[PDB]
């Protein structure tokens, strides 16, 4: 039961904006909704750990995964079991784009760590707000270009799961597009 | 450099023997670095785990994040400077506690560890073995851990040295020294 949805995209791409608009939209339709986010939905203190200066990308990813493991077990799976629409503002694809394409960590390793962390849980749809890198720990332009292109590659590899939207479109037009993709599921 | 670890249950004498081992090495003029897990990489992970109860998976992943920093910032640089690096707990702790204790599958733990450690393995690991009731869930968890350590040791008899932790401090230290002497001048 339940429906698992996520929002993805670069910093400043509108994920939180659209995630919250979606939650209220579905709540107004009488649907039970659980709005959550990463990092911090499993282990809130992970945000502190993530700020540590000079963190290796390996330790960085392992922190995101620790949070993700707790998040899936304690928040997402129980919410879905109750028949809720669970919306996560970021999920695993964030690590793949940032720690994989951005930091250069090997994707298969990321995936293998993820397999137990997530228990294989994948969103039914993922809305990728595609933002030019200039518009967006070493998070400079070259990193954001890698991450931006990584997300687009992840979307090409799973074109049924990913819905790619132009993040520069007006907020209301993006929301209407998100709603239209959901209409057949809800 | 030379990488050595100590392993065993809480109260098995790890920190004590790690201290005596460093002292022995100092007496021979051998540069030594004493370190520990958890907290050698990310001190905040230690303090957080002190007061927080998590899923085994999340717990292991924090120990691994800490371990990843520990290897990179402390252990590998120590070894590159030619030090004998002693870690009071390392990967075998996760295998015994999170693997055998909490039930996580070992091959998954090891694939996570593979990038976290950069494949860095101790040359020797001294396991200070004793029943949980002799250490200086209830007891069933700690028995799973103690048996897990012994499982690990019998799978890698070239790396593990298993000592009777109930012996007097000095005898154990001399036992450790005996095992180590072939690896030094
Ligand atoms: N479609 C949009 N066009 C222009 N600005 C937007 C749009 N959506 C959100 N914003 C604004 O951009 C900033 C970043 O939005 P936010 O939702 O925080 O992005 P993210 O959560 O992906 O970092 C906010 O100031 C927000 O008001
Ligand atoms: N061989 C031994 N015999 C008796 N007491 C010991 C011995 N080794 C250590 N101790 C004492 O036992 C306690 C636990 O030792 P410690 O080195 O802290 O173990 P761990 O680091 O494994 O928890 C300490 O109070 C220490 O003084
Ligand atoms: C969830 C997640 C976030 N991030 C980054 C994106 C942001 O720069 C930062 C905080 O995310 P937030 O701004 O969406 O809360 O964490 C990763 O690098 N990997 C991840 O897995
Ligand atoms: C290093 C490590 C320790 N532990 C446990 C064993 C001890 O109970 C505790 C360490 O406590 P300490 O920080 O007071 O020595 O952490 C694990 O469960 N897994 C690990 O990987
Ligand atoms: Ca984007
Ligand atoms: Ca946001
Ligand atoms: Ca929306
Ligand atoms: Ca803090
Ligand atoms: Ca996370
Ligand atoms: Ca993960
Ligand atoms: Ca996602
Ligand atoms: Ca960083
Ligand atoms: Ca509208
Ligand atoms: Ca100790
Ligand atoms: Ca650790
Ligand atoms: Ca590890
Ligand atoms: Ca005891
Ligand atoms: Ca066991
Ligand atoms: Ca055994
Ligand atoms: Cl797909
Ligand atoms: Cl679009
Ligand atoms: Cl012995």
Curated annotation (Swiss-Prot), chain A:
Pfam family, one: Thymidylate_kin
Annotated GO MF terms: ATP binding; dTMP kinase activity
EC number(s) on file: 2.7.4.9
GO CC field: cytosol
Reaction catalyzed: dTMP + ATP = dTDP + ADP
GO terms, biological process: dTDP biosynthetic process; dTTP biosynthetic process; dUDP biosynthetic process
Binding site for ATP: 9-16
Broad EC category: transferase
Record keywords: ATP-binding, Kinase, Nucleotide biosynthesis, Nucleotide-binding, Transferase
InterPro entries: P-loop_NTPase, Thymidylate_kin-like_dom, Thymidylate_kin_CS, Thymidylate_kinase
PROSITE patterns: THYMIDYLATE_KINASE (PS01331)
Regions crossing the membrane: none
Family matches, as SUPFAM superfamilies: P-loop containing nucleoside triphosphate hydrolases
Role summary: Phosphorylation of dTMP to form dTDP in both de novo and salvage pathways of dTTP synthesis.
UniProt similarity note: Belongs to the thymidylate kinase family.
HAMAP family on file: Thymidylate_kinase
PANTHER family documented for this protein: THYMIDYLATE KINASE (PTHR10344), UMP-CMP KINASE 2, MITOCHONDRIAL (PTHR10344:SF4)
Protein name: Thymidylate kinase
Source organism of the structure: Thermus thermophilus (strain ATCC 27634 / DSM 579 / HB8)
Organism lineage string: Bacteria, Thermotogati, Deinococcota, Deinococci, Thermales
Gene responsible for this protein: tmk
């Amino acid at each position: 039961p339940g429906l698992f949805l996520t929002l993805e995209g670069l910093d400043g791409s509108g994920k939180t904006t659209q995630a919250r608009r979606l939650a209220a939209f579905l709540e107004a339709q009488g649907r039970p909704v659980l709005l959550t986010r990463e990092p911090g939905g499993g282990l809130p203190e992970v945000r502190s750990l993530l700020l540590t200066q000079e963190l290796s990308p390996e330790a960085e990813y392992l922190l995101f995964s620790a949070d993700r493991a707790e998040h899936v077990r304690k928040v997402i799976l129980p919410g879905l079991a109750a028949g809720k629409v669970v919306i996560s503002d970021r999920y695993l694809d964030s690590s793949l784009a940032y720690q994989g394409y951005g930091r250069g960590l090997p994707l298969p390793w990321l995936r293998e760590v993820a397999r137990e962390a997530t228990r294989g849980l994948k969103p039914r749809l993922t809305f990728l707000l595609d933002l030019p890198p200039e518009a967006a720990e070493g998070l400079g332009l070259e990193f954001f270009r890698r991450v931006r292109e990584g997300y687009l590659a992840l979307a090409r590899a799973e074109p049924g799961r990913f819905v790619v939207l132009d993040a520069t479109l007006p907020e209301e037009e993006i929301a209407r597009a998100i709603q239209a993709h959901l209409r057949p599921l809800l």
